[PDB]
Symmetry: D2
Subunit: 117 residues, 4 copies
């Protein structure tokens, strides 16, 4: 994969983690928090996996590409799941709309890197 | 289910992350550090993925087996890779021997949970 | 102090996991709306403990100012998280357990702070 | 209030940029033939990236806000960014990756210090 595409994917992961954390926090402050618990949980998983993925991608050398691939697959899966749950709430909550978009961009960047590896 | 296997896997991830970070640090202090850079990188990847995996496994609200499986697969893959690289240096460095064993035990615990889910 | 360092790293990793588990358990409570500060403080504590475990693993003794500043942050957040979990500990065993993990990590951090000088 | 939330957003952005700069520097140092001379740089890069990502997360949360916690995390971030900048600056003449990282650390340090002065 391109070193520039790798840097772009790292940036997407770092930004997606932050977007998810912001959304989880916003959901926690909603009066309807009891209806947003899966959103919050999936936000937390996505942040944790994105954070790990950003770090792993920063050290990618092409040797043991199996590690990089496995981490990207996990990140794409969690970003997709988080985006799906945020998108369910996006009509009611702008924070969920914003987070869904960040999750989709990270998902796509991870898939692009997976295809290029 | 397999609540005991889940608890065991979480514990293994926490132990493995510490073993990996200790190994990375010890490699950085070796006079032969230039020969240990893949070990260091893979140690760091393994610690990062193990701590994310322990976090994801600890969460039951809004459980999504797709996420759980993907993260476990990533953890098993990175633990296997880290174990392999540490094992190359285990004859020369006790820190690498110890880390390899921790990686193998975590790999097996992840695989066991994957099979039981 | 190498033993106290290893103990503190272990405490930080365990405290992060305990906080994650508590946050998740609170998210699944029907009274989740009453537990939002607990959840938020759990999330902060996990994030700070995770960073602290990593930073302590690389401590070399020179640049003790980094180690001290991170330990102070970890002790502060652990104490705050323990205080908030303890508010709910009579009603929720998960909060009781989490408070105890926060206290043990707080003390391990303070012990290292006193020994670094 | 309003000015605080904008200063927080600025600091979050700086932390995310700084973490990436630090991880790029750490990786580049690991690939240098002179890696044995760059081990403190690598370690401090990793500390800075870890603390920056934690700090960005803490700053993103407003539910149940506790200024004492937020200040302690910002102090840690300011301290580690200053330390990382100092160590990268030692190598900046020889390595562009270290020069770039030093500048990112200084900008993040200042954003954290701005928030420390303003909150608090
Ligand atoms: Cu969501
Ligand atoms: Cu949402
Ligand atoms: Cu949201
Ligand atoms: Cu969301
Ligand atoms: Cu080792
Ligand atoms: Cu190792
Ligand atoms: Cu090794
Ligand atoms: Cu709590
Ligand atoms: Cu709890
Ligand atoms: Cu708690
Ligand atoms: Cu609680
Ligand atoms: Cu540096
Ligand atoms: Cu450097
Ligand atoms: Cu550098
Ligand atoms: Cu640097």
């Amino acid at each position: 994969v391109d070193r520039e595409a790798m840097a772009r994917c790292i940036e997407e992961c770092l930004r997606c983690a932050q977007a998810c954390t912001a959304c989880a926090d916003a959901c926690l402050s909603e009066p309807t928090v009891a209806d947003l618990t899966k959103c919050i949980r999936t936000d937390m998983d996505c942040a944790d996996v994105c954070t790990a993925t950003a770090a792993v991608l920063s050290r990618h050398t092409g040797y043991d590409a199996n590690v990089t691939r496995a981490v990207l697959q996990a990140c794409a899966t969690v970003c997709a799941a988080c985006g799906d749950e945020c998108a369910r709430h996006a009509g009611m909550h702008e924070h969920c709309r914003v987070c869904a978009e960040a999750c989709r961009s990270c998902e796509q960047a991870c898939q692009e890197l997976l295809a290029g590896l």
